[PDB]
Amino acid sequence: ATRGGEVTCFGSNISSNKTVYNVYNGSRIFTDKDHGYSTNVDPQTLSSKGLIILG
Amino acid sequence: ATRGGEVTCFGSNISSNKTVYNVYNGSRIFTDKDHGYSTNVDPQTLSSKGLIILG
To answer: How many angstroms separate the CA of residue B38 from the nearest CA in chain A?
Structure first.
């Protein structure tokens, strides 16, 4: 996610080695915490990069 | 609201005994402050359940 814009991928069964959820330039992502997936930013705090809600 | 998704019920006039605004699994709600209505989560905070801006 870049330059804004949400990715409301809640129950995704993602499977990859790299960082799963990525956020850049103030863009949000929303997802579940059932599967522990690597995140570019701290789970549920704002930043210069967009906010994620791993909950 | 659950698993993401917004409910921008700003000027809503609601009348019920249950909690007026509810959020689960990362959802968001934006509403007014003039009306004094119950809320499931503390208004402006990030948690496993998403923000509920009462502004």
So the answer is: 22
